[PDB]
Structures are given as structure tokens and as C-alpha cells.
Design a protein around this ligand. Structure first.
Ligand code: HEC
Length: 92
């Protein structure tokens, strides 16, 4: 169900909802979460592709309720396709 979307809107969604814990650049520093470079091909066993990550990123995960250490989810379909379109181009 993933359809190539907007990398522009995806890049904005990354700085707002992912950058806080993750980095995309080659040889990026491990932050609260791992470096997502080369994520599409890598596993944990979960062979990362666009559709299985769209499912993964749909649900929010509160690590420390009360602080900004929590992922907010991507409940809108457009937002997931946008973020993945960006992320796919930026993690290689
Ligand atoms: C901190 C509050 C996080 C935010 C915001 C996002 N992620 Fe996350 N992510 C985080 C941690 C602590 C972990 C480790 C494993 C766990 O489930 O706890 C992850 C892991 C990922 C992964 C898996 C990477 C891998 O197994 O190599 C992906 C693909 C991932 N996170 C993507 C991702 C995206 C796209 C986010 C924003 C939309 C995002 N994460 C935010 C912590 C946090």
C-alpha cells in the first residue's frame, strides 16, 4: 500500500518527529535511537522495506511518559508515504 510521495514534506516530517532521536547521514552518530543510514536492506529479524516500515511507524511509542523521549506516530497515510519517500532517498 506504500505509494511514492513527497520527499520535501517527508524531510520536514523527519526534522519534526525523527531527528530528535535519529540521524540519516553516512557514519552518523548514534543518538537516543540508531543511525538510520542504509536501513532499507538491514534488519533488527525484520527485512526493512517501504511497506513494513509504514506499518512500523504508524503506532506511537512513549519511552518516558512526561518528557520529549517519545515517538508521536504517523497516523496519516500521506505522512508515512512522504516520510518514507524522503527517508529512502536520504539513507543512501
Ligand atoms: C525517540 C523518542 C525516537 C523517535 C522520535 C523516533 N525513534 Fe525510531 N527508534 C528509537 C529507538 C530508541 C529505537 C531502537 C529500537 C526500539 O524499538 O526501541 C528506534 C529504532 C528505529 C528503527 C529501527 C532501526 C533498526 O532496527 O536498525 C527505525 C527504522 C526507526 N526507529 C525509525 C524512526 C523514524 C522513521 C522516526 C520518525 C518518524 C523515528 N524512528 C522516531 C527512538 C526514536
Amino acid at each position: 500500500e506504500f505509494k511514492a510521495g513527497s520527499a520535501k514534506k517527508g524531510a520536514t516530517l523527519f526534522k519534526t518527529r525523527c531527528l530528535q532521536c535519529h540521524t540519516v547521514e553516512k557514519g552518523g552518530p548514534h543518538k537516543v535511537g540508531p543511525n538510520l543510514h542504509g536501513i532499507f536492506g538491514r534488519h533488527s529479524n525484520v527485512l526493512w522495506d517501504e511497506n513494513n516500515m509504514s506499518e512500523y511507524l504508524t503506532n506511537p511509542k512513549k519511552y518516558i511518559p512526561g518528557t520529549k523521549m517519545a515517538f508521536g506516530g504517523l497516523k496519516k497515510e500521506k505522512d508515512r508515504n512522504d516520510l518514507i519517500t524522503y527517508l529512502k532517498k536520504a539513507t543512501e
